[PDB]
Amino acid sequence: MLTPGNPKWERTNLTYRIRNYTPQLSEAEVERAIKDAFELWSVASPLIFTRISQGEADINIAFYQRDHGDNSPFDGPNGILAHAFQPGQGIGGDAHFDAEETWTNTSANYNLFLVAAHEFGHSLGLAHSSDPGALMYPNYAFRETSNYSLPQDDIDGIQAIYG
Numbered sequence: 001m002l003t004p005g006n007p008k009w010e011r012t013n014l015t016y017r018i019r020n021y022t023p024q025l026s027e028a029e030v031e032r033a034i035k036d037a038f039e040l041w042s043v044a045s046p047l048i049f050t051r052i053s054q055g056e057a058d059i060n061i062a063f064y065q066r067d068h069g070d071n072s073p074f075d076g077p078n079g080i081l082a083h084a085f086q087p088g089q090g091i092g093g094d095a096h097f098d099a100e101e102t103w104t105n106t107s108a109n110y111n112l113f114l115v116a117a118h119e120f121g122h123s124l125g126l127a128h129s130s131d132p133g134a135l136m137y138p139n140y141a142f143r144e145t146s147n148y149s150l151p152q153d154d155i156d157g158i159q160a161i162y163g
């Protein structure tokens with residue numbers, strides 16, 4: 001469950017910024033998905049996330065298509081959904097979402113809140129889990145989102161890094 005080399009944030013109050021949006025959800029819907037994805041991790045750790053509207057943030061969030069500057073191009077509809085970088089300066093921590101997906105707040109593929117929640121595990125230093133019940137499992141699946149809380153394996157993982 002931890003990324004190789006154990007990269008972790010040295011501070012526990014991190015900022016984030018949503019750089020752009022996906023047209024398929026309202027702006028408020030995207031903001032809510034992201035807010036709630038961060039809160040999943042915050043309630044199981046000492047981490048506090050502060051949104052900023054402009055300027056430089058620890059965790060940049062953006063929707064991109066195909067080639068987007070980081071040498072890991074997205075691939076169009078389906079396939080890779082999103083990716084994120086391990087804790088560190090600059091691109092470290094940042095989370096990118098494939099702009100060519102269908103992004104939802106429903107049970108229809110792909111629920112943005114769930115994908116974001118998984119990606120922020122990477123942004124915080126977690127690796128993939130082998131535990132098919134974990135949020136950090138390597139394959140997407142819908143789960144009910146209305147009252148969602150971190151699966152136990154992911155609590156264990158974030159606790160192992162940050163207490």
Ligand SMILES: O=C(O)[C@H]1Cc2ccccc2CN1S(=O)(=O)c1ccc(-c2ccccc2)cc1
Nearest residue numbers: 080081082083114115118135137138139140141
């Ligand atoms: O893992 C990633 O971040 C990226 C990049 C990567 C790198 C190395 C190995 C596999 C993958 C798979 N992809 S992905 O886009 O296909 C993906 C995204 C989210 C979820 C997920 C799981 C559970 C709940 C909700 C979402 C699963 C897979």
Ligand SMILES: [Ca+2]
Nearest residue numbers: 058090091092
């Ligand atoms: Ca960053």
Ligand SMILES: [Ca+2]
Nearest residue numbers: 076078080098
């Ligand atoms: Ca894709």
Ligand SMILES: [Zn+2]
Nearest residue numbers: 068070072096
């Ligand atoms: Zn990228």
Ligand SMILES: [Zn+2]
Nearest residue numbers: 118122128138
């Ligand atoms: Zn992943």
